C-alpha cells in the first residue's frame, strides 16, 4: 500500500556471520537523541529515503537495510556514542574496496543531524574477504623470497626527496645498501618530475641495487614509486621494474586510489613483485578523534586491496596500544575483540596473508631497542635522516643501524629486556663498532 | 622426533564442523572384515593427508589444519555393510573459483582405495565462504526471464532430430518451423558439435536465419541452443 509521503534502529537484531559490521563514533546535533542518531547513521548509509517511493514495493527492503543494532556512550565524552551498524553481504561488490568504502562512508558523514562522525572499525566477514586477492605476497612469502629471517628489515628513505639528479640519487642508494640496509626508498612525492624523470631513476637505482647486492652477498631492493596520474602510467612503471628484474615497487594507495591500487596489486601478484605501500594523506582523514576514519579501517582496506608493506607510523616514544592493535589486524590471521587496543570486532582473515608494518619518522639508533620491542621481527624500520645524517656518510650510517639492530636482536634472543636494558645494549655495541659509536654521539 | 614411519588421525567423532568447511557425505561399502570406523577413517585419510609411511616434512607444518576428518558415521537402514561417512575438509585446501580443484581434492583419489569395496559421493555442503569465489550462472533464472520477457510458464524447446545426417540448411528449416509454432527454443543434440556434412559455422548461420524468421513472424523472442 503505497501512499506518497514523508525502520533503522533495531536493538533486537542479531548479526549474521556474513554481515559487514561497522563501529561509528557519532556526535549528534543538539536536540537529537542518540537512538535517533544511530538510526540516521544506518539509514543514511543504506536504504533511507526522505519521502516514500513506490518502487520499494518491488523488493524486500529489510533484506538491504543497514541496521543500528547497538549504541553505547563514549567514555569521557558528553555527546559522543559508538553506534554499531550491520550491512548485508549483498550490498557489496565482490573484490572492490572502492565499493565497500562507497557503500559505508560515501554519504552518511554529511548528514545534517550528525555534528560529527568517525568510522572506528569494520568487521570484514570471511565470505567477503575471500573475494579479494589481498597482499601480492605477504609477510612469510616476502621473507622466503628475500631469504631474510629473525630480525626487522631496514631501509633508508632518500633525501632530499626532490632536487637530486637520477644518478646522484642512485649513488646515495648504493652507499646505503652496501652498508647493511635491506632497502632504500623513493619519497611518496617522488613519482616523475622535471630534473628526475622516473625511467632514469629506475635505471640508476637498479644499478645501485645490483652493485650493493654483488658487494655484500645479500639481496637488496629499492621501493621504486609507481604512483602516477593515470593507471596506464602506473602500470608502465611497474612493467619496467619487472623488466629490470628488481624485487619491489611502491604505491601511495590513498592518493592514487583503491581502484588503481588493486590493479597494481594484481600486476605485482602476476609478476612476482613485492609492493611497498605508503599512506600519504592519511592524516587528512584519520587524525581527529571526532571526525573521519581511524587508520585501522584504512589499514584493513589496504590488506584487502593489496600490499606487502604498509607504513604504520613511528609509535616511537617510550599511540602505543592503538598501534599494536592495528598492527595485529594487519599481520595476524585471527584477532580477538580488544577495546583496550581499538579492536571493536573480532577479525578472522581466513588465511589471507599479512602485511609488514613499516615504522618511520625521526628515529635513530637510540630508538632501535624500543622499535624492536614494539614491532618484533615482522616489521620494516625506515631511517632517513638516521642514515644520511651519519657523520661518516651513508655506508657507515647503514652499518650503524644494522649493527644497532642486530645487537638488540641478539640481546632479545638471549632473554634480555629491551624495554629496560636498551641503552646498555647499544652502549655495549659501541665498544666494538666505531660506526655505531659515531652515530650515538650525534643523536643522544 | 622423526622416526621410521608406519583412524589414528582421521576418525574424529568429536569434531564440530566449521562454517567454512566443505562437507561431504560418502556412501561407503567396506571390504569384508573392515570395521565401519576404519572405513570412515580411510575415506578421510585417502581424500586428504593420509600417508603410508611417516615423512619428516610433516614436522614443518601443522597437519590437523589440513586433514580431512570423518566426523560422523551412520549405518544405512537395510544394509549389513553400508554406511554414510561424513567428512569435513578445511577451506584452505581448495583453490578459489575452481570446481576442478574441488573435485580433484575430494574425489580425486579415495575411490580407488582397496579397503573400500564401493564408494559414492552423495552430497557436498558448499560453504558461502567458498561459493562466493565463483561467478556462478552467467545470468540465472530471474535475469533470463527478464531478458527473454517470458513469465508464468515453463519454457518449451525441441531437440532437433535426426541429430546427424541433415544438411545445415535442412536442419535450420526444421528449427524455423518448430519456433514459429510456439516453442521458445530449438536445440543442438549433445553430439552435434562440428562434423562432416554439417560444419558448425554453417549450422550457426542457418539456425540464426531461422531464429530471426520465426521471431519476426510470431513477435516473441526466440533462441536455439
Amino acid at each position: 500500500g503505497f501512499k506518497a509521503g514523508v525502520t533503522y534502529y533495531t536493538p533486537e537484531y542479531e548479526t549474521k556471520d556474513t554481515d559487514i559490521l561497522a563501529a561509528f563514533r557519532v556526535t549528534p546535533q543538539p536536540g537529537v537523541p542518540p537512538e535517533e542518531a544511530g538510526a540516521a547513521v544506518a539509514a543514511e548509509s543504506s536504504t533511507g529515503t526522505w519521502t516514500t517511493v513506490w518502487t520499494d514495493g518491488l523488493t524486500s527492503l529489510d533484506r538491504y537495510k543497514g541496521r543500528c543494532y547497538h549504541i553505547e556512550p563514549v567514555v569521557g565524552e558528553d555527546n559522543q556514542y559508538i553506534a554499531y551498524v550491520a550491512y548485508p553481504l549483498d550490498l557489496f561488490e565482490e573484490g572492490s574496496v572502492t565499493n565497500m568504502f562507497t557503500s559505508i562512508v560515501g554519504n552518511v558523514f554529511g548528514f545534517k543531524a550528525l555534528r560529527a562522525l568517525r568510522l572506528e572499525d569494520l568487521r570484514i566477514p570471511p565470505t567477503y574477504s575471500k573475494t579479494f586477492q589481498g597482499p601480492p605476497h605477504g609477510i612469510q612469502v616476502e621473507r622466503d623470497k628475500l631469504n631474510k629471517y629473525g630480525r626487522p628489515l631496514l631501509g633508508c628513505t632518500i633525501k632530499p626527496k626532490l632536487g637530486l639528479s637520477a644518478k646522484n640519487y642512485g649513488r646515495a642508494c648504493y652507499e646505503c645498501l652496501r652498508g647493511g640496509l635491506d632497502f632504500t626508498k623513493d619519497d611518496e612525492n617522488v613519482n616523475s618530475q622535471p630534473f628526475m624523470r622516473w625511467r632514469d631513476r629506475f635505471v640508476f637505482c637498479a644499478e645501485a641495487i645490483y652493485k650493493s647486492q654483488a658487494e655484500t652477498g645479500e639481496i637488496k631492493g629499492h621501493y621504486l614509486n609507481a604512483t602516477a596520474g593515470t593507471c596506464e602510467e602506473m602500470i608502465k612503471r611497474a612493467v619496467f621494474a619487472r623488466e629490470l628484474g628488481v624485487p619491489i615497487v611502491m604505491h601511495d594507495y590513498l592518493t592514487g586510489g583503491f581502484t588503481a591500487n588493486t590493479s597494481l596489486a594484481h600486476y605485482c601478484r602476476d609478476n612476482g613483485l613485492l609492493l611497498h605501500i605508503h599512506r600519504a594523506m592519511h592524516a587528512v582523514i584519520d587524525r581527529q578523534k571526532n571526525h573521519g576514519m581511524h587508520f585501522r579501517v584504512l589499514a584493513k582496506a589496504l590488506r584487502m586491496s593489496g600490499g606487502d608493506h604498509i607504513h604504520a607510523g613511528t609509535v616511537v616514544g617510550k599511540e602505543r596500544e592503538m598501534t599494536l592493535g592495528f598492527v595485529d589486524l594487519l599481520r595476524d590471521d585471527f584477532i580477538e575483540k580488544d577495546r583496550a587496543r581499538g579492536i571493536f570486532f573480532t577479525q578472522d582473515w581466513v588465511s589471507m596473508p599479512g602485511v609488514i608494518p613499516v615504522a618511520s619518522g625521526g628515529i635513530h639508533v637510540w630508538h632501535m631497542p624500543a622499535l624492536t620491542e614494539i614491532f618484533g621481527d615482522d616489521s620494516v624500520l625506515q631511517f632517513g635522516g638516521g642514515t644520511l645524517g651519519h657523520p661518516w656518510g651513508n655506508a657507515p650510517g647503514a652499518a650503524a643501524n644494522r649493527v644497532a639492530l642486530e645487537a638488540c636482536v641478539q640481546a632479545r634472543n638471549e632473554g634480555r629486556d629491551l624495554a629496560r636494558e636498551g641503552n646498555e645494549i647499544i652502549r655495549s655495541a659501541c665498544k666494538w663498532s666505531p660506526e655505531l659509536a659515531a652515530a650515538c654521539e650525534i643523536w643522544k | 622426533g622423526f622416526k621410521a614411519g608406519v583412524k589414528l588421525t582421521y576418525y574424529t567423532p568429536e569434531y564440530e564442523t566449521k562454517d567454512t568447511d566443505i562437507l561431504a557425505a560418502f556412501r561407503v561399502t567396506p571390504q569384508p572384515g573392515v570395521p565401519p570406523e576404519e572405513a570412515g577413517a580411510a575415506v578421510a585419510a585417502e581424500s586428504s593427508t593420509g600417508t603410508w609411511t611417516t615423512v619428516w616434512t610433516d614436522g614443518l607444518t601443522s597437519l590437523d589444519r589440513y586433514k580431512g576428518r570423518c566426523y560422523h558415521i551412520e549405518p544405512v537402514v537395510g544394509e549389513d555393510n553400508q554406511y554414510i561417512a561424513y567428512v569435513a575438509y578445511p577451506l584452505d585446501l581448495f583453490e578459489e573459483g575452481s570446481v576442478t580443484n574441488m573435485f580433484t581434492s575430494i574425489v580425486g583419489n579415495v575411490f580407488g582405495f582397496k579397503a573400500l569395496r564401493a564408494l559414492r559421493l552423495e552430497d557436498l555442503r558448499i560453504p558461502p565462504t567458498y561459493s562466493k569465489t565463483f561467478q556462478g550462472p552467467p545470468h540465472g533464472i530471474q535475469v533470463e526471464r527478464d531478458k527473454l520477457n517470458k513469465y508464468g510458464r515453463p519454457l518449451l524447446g525441441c531437440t532437433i532430430k535426426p541429430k546427424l545426417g541433415l544438411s545445415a540448411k535442412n536442419y535450420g528449416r526444421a528449427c524455423y518451423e518448430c519456433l514459429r509454432g510456439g516453442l521458445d527454443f530449438t536445440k543442438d543434440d549433445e553430439n552435434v558439435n562440428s562434423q562432416p556434412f554439417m560444419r558448425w559455422r554453417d549450422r550457426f548461420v542457418f539456425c540464426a536465419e531461422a531464429i530471426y524468421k520465426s521471431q519476426a513472424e510470431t513477435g516473441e523472442i526466440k533462441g536455439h541452443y
Binding site: 621473507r143 629473525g150 652477498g217 628484474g245 645487537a407 638471549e414 660506526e435 | 622423526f2
Partner: protein, 122 residues
C-alpha cells in the same frame, strides 16, 4: 671519518654484522630457538652468497638454498646437541660455510637463519 670496507666483509643476513660469535654466544642463540619451540637445522655450502644464473625475473635468485646437513633436529632439548652436529659438519666440510636455521611448524615456515662457521679464508 672511516670508510666502510668494499671487500672481505660479505654477509649472511641476521647476526653477521656482529663480531664472530663465541661458543657461549652460539649456545644462547640455539637455546632461544629451543625455548621458542622451533626446530634447529644445519645448512652448508661452498658458495656463500646469492647470484642470478638461471633467471632475473622479480623474486628469483639462485644461491638462496644451501644444502641440508642431515635433518631438522625434531625433539631436540639439548642445545649442546646442535653444537655437536656443527662440529661434525666443520670436520666433514672445513672449506664450506655452515649456518643454523630454524623451522616452526605453527607458523609453518623457516623463521631463523644465522651464520655459525666460515672457512679459514672467508
Amino acid at each position: 671519518m672511516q670508510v666502510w670496507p668494499i671487500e672481505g666483509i660479505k654477509k649472511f643476513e641476521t647476526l653477521s654484522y656482529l663480531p664472530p660469535l663465541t661458543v657461549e654466544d652460539l649456545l644462547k642463540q640455539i637455546e632461544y630457538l629451543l625455548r621458542s619451540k622451533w626446530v634447529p637445522c644445519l645448512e652448508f655450502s661452498k658458495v656463500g652468497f646469492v647470484y642470478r644464473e638461471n633467471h632475473r625475473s622479480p623474486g628469483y635468485y639462485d644461491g638462496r638454498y644451501w644444502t641440508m646437513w642431515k635433518l631438522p633436529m625434531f625433539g631436540c632439548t639439548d642445545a649442546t646437541q646442535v653444537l655437536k652436529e656443527l662440529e661434525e659438519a666443520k670436520k666433514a666440510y672445513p672449506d664450506a660455510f655452515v649456518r643454523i636455521i630454524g623451522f616452526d611448524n605453527v607458523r609453518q615456515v623457516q623463521l631463523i637463519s644465522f651464520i655459525a662457521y666460515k672457512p679459514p679464508g672467508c
